[PDB]
Design a protein around this ligand. Sequence first.
Ligand SMILES: [Cl-]
Ligand SMILES: [Cl-]
Ligand SMILES: [Mg+2]
Ligand SMILES: [Mg+2]
Ligand SMILES: [Mg+2]
Ligand SMILES: [Mg+2]
Ligand SMILES: [Mg+2]
Ligand SMILES: [Mg+2]
Ligand SMILES: [Mg+2]
Ligand SMILES: [Mg+2]
Ligand code: NA
Ligand code: NA
Ligand code: NA
Ligand code: NA
Ligand code: NA
Ligand SMILES: [Sr+2]
Ligand SMILES: [Sr+2]
Ligand SMILES: [Sr+2]
Ligand SMILES: [Sr+2]
Ligand SMILES: [Sr+2]
Ligand SMILES: [Sr+2]
Ligand SMILES: [Sr+2]
Ligand SMILES: [Sr+2]
Lengths: 140, 160, 186, 154, 95
Amino acid sequence: FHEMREPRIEKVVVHMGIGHANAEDILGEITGQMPVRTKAKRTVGEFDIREGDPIGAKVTLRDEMAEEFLQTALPLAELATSQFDDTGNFSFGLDVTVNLVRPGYRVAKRDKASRSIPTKHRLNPADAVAFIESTYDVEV
Amino acid sequence: KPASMYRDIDKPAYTRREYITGIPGSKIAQHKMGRKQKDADDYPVQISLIVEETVQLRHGSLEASRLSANRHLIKELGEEGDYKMTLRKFPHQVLRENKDGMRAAFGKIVGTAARVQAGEQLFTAYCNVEDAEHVKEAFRRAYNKITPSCRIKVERGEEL
Amino acid sequence: ATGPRYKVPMRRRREARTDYHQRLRLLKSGKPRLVARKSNKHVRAQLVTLGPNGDDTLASAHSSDLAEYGWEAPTGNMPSAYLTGLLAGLRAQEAGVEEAVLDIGLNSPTPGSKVFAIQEGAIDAGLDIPHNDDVLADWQRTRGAHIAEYDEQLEEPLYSGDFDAADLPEHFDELRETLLDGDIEL
Amino acid sequence: MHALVQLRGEVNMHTDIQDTLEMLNIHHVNHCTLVPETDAYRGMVAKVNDFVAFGEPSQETLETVLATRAEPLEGDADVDDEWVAEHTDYDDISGLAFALLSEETTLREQGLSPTLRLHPPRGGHDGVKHPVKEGGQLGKHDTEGIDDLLEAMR
Amino acid sequence: PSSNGPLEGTRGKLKNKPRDRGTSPPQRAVEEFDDGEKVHLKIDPSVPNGRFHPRFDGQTGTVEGKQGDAYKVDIVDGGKEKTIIVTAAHLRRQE
RNA sequence: CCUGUCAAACUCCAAACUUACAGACGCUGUUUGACGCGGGGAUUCCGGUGCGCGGGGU
RNA sequence: AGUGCAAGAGCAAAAGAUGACUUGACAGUGUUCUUCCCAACGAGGAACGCUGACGCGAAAGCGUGGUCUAGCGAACCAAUU
RNA sequence: UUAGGCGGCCACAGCGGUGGGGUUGCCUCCCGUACCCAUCCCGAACACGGAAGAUAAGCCCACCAGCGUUCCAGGGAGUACUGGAGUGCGCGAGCCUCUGGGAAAUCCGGUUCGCCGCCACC
Ligand SMILES: [Cl-]
Ligand SMILES: [Cl-]
Ligand SMILES: [Mg+2]
Ligand SMILES: [Mg+2]
Ligand SMILES: [Mg+2]
Ligand SMILES: [Mg+2]
Ligand SMILES: [Mg+2]
Ligand SMILES: [Mg+2]
Ligand SMILES: [Mg+2]
Ligand SMILES: [Mg+2]
Ligand code: NA
Ligand code: NA
Ligand code: NA
Ligand code: NA
Ligand code: NA
Ligand SMILES: [Sr+2]
Ligand SMILES: [Sr+2]
Ligand SMILES: [Sr+2]
Ligand SMILES: [Sr+2]
Ligand SMILES: [Sr+2]
Ligand SMILES: [Sr+2]
Ligand SMILES: [Sr+2]
Ligand SMILES: [Sr+2]
């Protein structure tokens, strides 16, 4: 019961929303794996006439690659209360977002007979803080 | 122009503003009169003005009658008396006029009117027992400025 | 849900189990579907045809009933998949079924996968099914040689329950041998 | 079983109405036919409703009328008990009349014209511009009311 | 009419009621009809192909063979006999 | 929440009614041959009125 | 929402978006409906087949241009294959 | 069907909620990347290999009607509208009687928290 309910890190997405690159090199070295470009939609007056074109990049970290990053990433930002998604996620920082969820998430990500996670099984801001706080730092 | 030109319902409903342009504004200044803050149920007497024939009443007549009716209520009950009258209909029907002979005769927009079936409530006033004979008089003046004959019916009141 | 105007998906689309767009293109052939479905532990293969109140399964085979012919191995792998297909394909021949079209449901058409293995089995059983040989896994991986070589990187036994230490793709050969035999109580 | 009597002429009446009448074997004003009460026949008289006079006649009245106005399928031959006896499945007019009312046979089945060609109503009818409920002579009638008509047109 | 195209004045008949919106069930698009069978003609708004002229909606023809997968249904427009090529998707059995 | 109005180019609804096919009854056709097919000859392509439903227009 | 453009209609594991590959916007010949309700009438149009040759896909299958309804032209003569 | 696969009808099946269920069984979540295959970056997904753990998700089972929907009774209503007829009424727009049909909103109480087909299976 309690084991199949205790949270885990789904993914850690580190991204840099520039606007026009040379920044791929830093993310690659700080995360470990290979990064990916980021395009945009809708023409903007801030010199964005080319729809599909590089603006930024991101990296989705999973498993160890994610934890080994968080250990040397969390000690760099003062986490707050408001800095938490109603779902149970948080973004701080070069942005760094941590997606958290319970053991049976695959049900909503798979192809065959997928189903959305019930609100009860959906993580909570409180349950989120606790789990994280219970791992090398303080809250609020 | 005479009401003879528009009083009868003899054309299709012409109200789709998305297809009609240049429609003249409504001369009807207000629809809520008296004390619009107090409720209708806070009054012992509720007298309505009922139209006895199905007709089309132009916004000019609507304003003219609503005016001469409420202008009386003001005179008799003061500018802030304990009454509250209501004009429930709104000029939805757009009117034309073929103002060339019968060639390309579809007319231009000249006004608006409110369609009212027989037996409908054009006006409904809410007053106290004492001021009941005043509203009846305001309505007597009002039915004089609209095409049909009317009935002044007391909907809530056995004080007589 | 929301109101009267609202549109609720067809039950099997709601459930995310049936791809109706692919189903129509499938049915257009006029032949029966060789429904190839797979689970975490097992593999199923049904020879389905169309019917007035719903589909009709004329023949079928489940990896579970594979042991009934001497299968002491797991049931969610390549040799298992192929064999289940061959079994199903054989029962199909008996029921009068001679041709079919592979229906892989919501599975992906990945080269060498289990559904193509299931397909190779049914075809081998004597069924005429539109296929493409270069999308099928090579004979050895079908046998289960990929797992024996995985067990070679031992140090720790691959199989928990004692089937054997080094594993036997020869067991596959034994079973296939058993099925192709004219006798066998289907 | 009802007795239909055309009381209004063909001129100006809708074609689909005039056709229905003709299907009910009635081609002239003052002509009568005996129609069974069935769903199909009910739809037919409903359509003819405003140009006809109908209702269930009494055994007695049906006999008076058959005696006086019934004709063979061909000829002037008087339809009397003797005639009825020699050509029909009955012994007399009453026998026939009972069968018609009980809807066991028809006028054709017994070699009789399906039409009773009646005489104008003696002393006149109640008018052809109003129904029975309004003092007219059109539409459904009382068993007593229909008899008064059929007898007056004997 | 203001124009004379095939879809002229066909707003109602070629539109689905909100709840019938979306892709139609494959079953009826595959239905097999036999020669001599009486079938009702009704265009399925959700199905683009294999339609007949909207003027023939409501007819009840007689299947008299097929051309490809589509059927050849006989009908009588007014007093004139016509043959209509139509796919099962827009056909229903009578009774 | 409460309170007051509408739609030829709106519709969650929805007739009467019109309409395809078939059965039944009716009527009709098999010496008055219907239904249908083939051929000869046209006239006709200024219409009008009543009622019902209209659209334009005082 | 989007789907080139009136308006109305169709579309969500798509008819939309992205990506990649591709040239079926192919040759030949028809059936049917439309044009022209009923009911004769050309060009034009569409749906649906067959033969040939191809593209894509694991395959069923999809592609006879653009989701559907507008974007069209006789004889004579010239040019062209 | 002590949890399965494929379906038909495509909300009576939706939305939301409550309770129950799994030793070598089932479905899962689950564990794991040598392979087939995979990510414009991630064994996340897809694909493959497999059981140490779990029934908390899903799923299956039982049940609740607050919202949406289906149907039924009574009320609204034989009202609104309407096919046929009238030397019936009205200056008239229009109305009425007879005949054959007949709503919608809404009120009230019930219903509905899917039904059915095929194959497999303590
Ligand atoms: Cl599957
Ligand atoms: Cl057609
Ligand atoms: Mg005679
Ligand atoms: Mg006299
Ligand atoms: Mg008289
Ligand atoms: Mg229309
Ligand atoms: Mg010339
Ligand atoms: Mg040239
Ligand atoms: Mg539970
Ligand atoms: Mg008069
Ligand atoms: Na790029
Ligand atoms: Na002029
Ligand atoms: Na549909
Ligand atoms: Na043509
Ligand atoms: Na569970
Ligand atoms: Sr008019
Ligand atoms: Sr007056
Ligand atoms: Sr009509
Ligand atoms: Sr197309
Ligand atoms: Sr994993
Ligand atoms: Sr007069
Ligand atoms: Sr006058
Ligand atoms: Sr009734």
